[PDB]
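A reminder before we start the practical. When you read a complex entry, don't treat the lines as separate problems. The point of joint prediction is that each chain is placed relative to the others, so the output describes one connected object in space. Small molecules and nucleic acid strands, if listed, are placed in the same frame. In the example below there are two entries. Take a minute to note the order of the lines before looking further.
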Amino acid sequence: MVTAHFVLIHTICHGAWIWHKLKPALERAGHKVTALDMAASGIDPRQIEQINSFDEYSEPLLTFLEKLPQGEKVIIVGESCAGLNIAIAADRYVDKIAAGVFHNSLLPDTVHSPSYTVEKLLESFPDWRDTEYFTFTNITGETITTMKLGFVLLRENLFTKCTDGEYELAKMVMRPGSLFQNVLAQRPKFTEKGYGSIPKVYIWTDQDKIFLPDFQRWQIANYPPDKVYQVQGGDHKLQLTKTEEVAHILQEVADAYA
Amino acid sequence: MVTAHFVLIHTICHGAWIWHKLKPALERAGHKVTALDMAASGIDPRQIEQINSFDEYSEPLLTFLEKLPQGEKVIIVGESCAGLNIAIAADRYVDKIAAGVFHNSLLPDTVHSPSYTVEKLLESFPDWRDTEYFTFTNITGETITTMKLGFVLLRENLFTKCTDGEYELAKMVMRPGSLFQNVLAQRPKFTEKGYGSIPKVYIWTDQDKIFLPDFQRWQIANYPPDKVYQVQGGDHKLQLTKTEEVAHILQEVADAYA
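Here is the predicted structure of the whole assembly.
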């Protein structure tokens, strides 16, 4: 069992900051941790309107993996929508990914369109409350739907059991984001040789108020992960409300695959 | 109990996020709170290289105050270098500022150059450790010194007694910033009619490891504030390490001036 290199990927609208409690926790256990901002997220200098696909949105991760020296492997950890980022990354860089970890995350598959898990998320959770929507046109003329996440949604559905301070942090650094759903829908399927071949660990809680239990159980059924860790209690942001438990799970992921 | 409107201004390199613990604390006491990102700070879309002065850097605050309805007054609260922001704001909008609060802050005066307190800060604390410096050229050809704050400096001097998680947050969302020192040096002195005339409350601790005790006592001597509140312990980021104490002090500021 080797100390691992965890790469932490936030969901859309969010940024590396979401991982502020979890990073030091992992580091305390001797692990190396990188927490990247995806495009137009966190303090990344770009604006969402100049991003054209989910693949572009994933560039910082892809550029990170490109630069990683031969023979070293990371464990990619992804929250909410970042399951897509993992899938995208593993197709490009399978030989550098020891395992993919899904944290109340979309779990894309190889058999359906890349947008499939997103169609389902939205089917299960159609009403995003006070969230506002805008559109822009991407470089090939697709109409992209972006979102500014509603403060009530943040409070009640995403950061349900977090500290008032964590919720306040979120409102202070939340940014517009997008699922690039129609562009995903036209994307090639994720490959078996790459994404398909990586170990997959699925961490979740039934107390999640946006990625609902039915949906998450459906995801597990539709594409069985190699390990499922169900966490009691908390909320959608386990890395805030159950930081120490998640750190411990990731220990086990490292022992298993790193 | 008086209820006030606090406007919270972070130091350079930082952002409104620095106030995540203190905002809800004040709101719990029934107060209204606005925490603004200054230019090229936090999640403000601009880059530091497109900002030319400290006055520009202050635009968000100035715009905020411009929009504030007649007869409404705020208490501006400023940390570290944000004392400058207060001075700048009070010269423009004295009739909307009930009081200025200085939180381990630069306390500019009316008698010297605006850069005076900065010359002194740097005199007292010349070695910014692993901080890296870059330059760019502003709209009138002044060579501007920007800084990426060092991670050791963050740890040991700025966030000395904060949680590992708060320190990790800082590294995740810290941005380049600048004192615009040479441009401050050429700026008109702060006025008596505006900045001079506002109540000033100076909050600090002698456990601060960047704004050192000799410097802070010197600042109090050089321009006596209307009230000085010395907080035992903590560190430079009192709003993280002594959140509740600071909230309470601000209550007293509200009762006195709001």
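Discuss with your neighbour: The CA atoms of residues 26 and 247 of chain B lie 6 Å apart. What might explain this?
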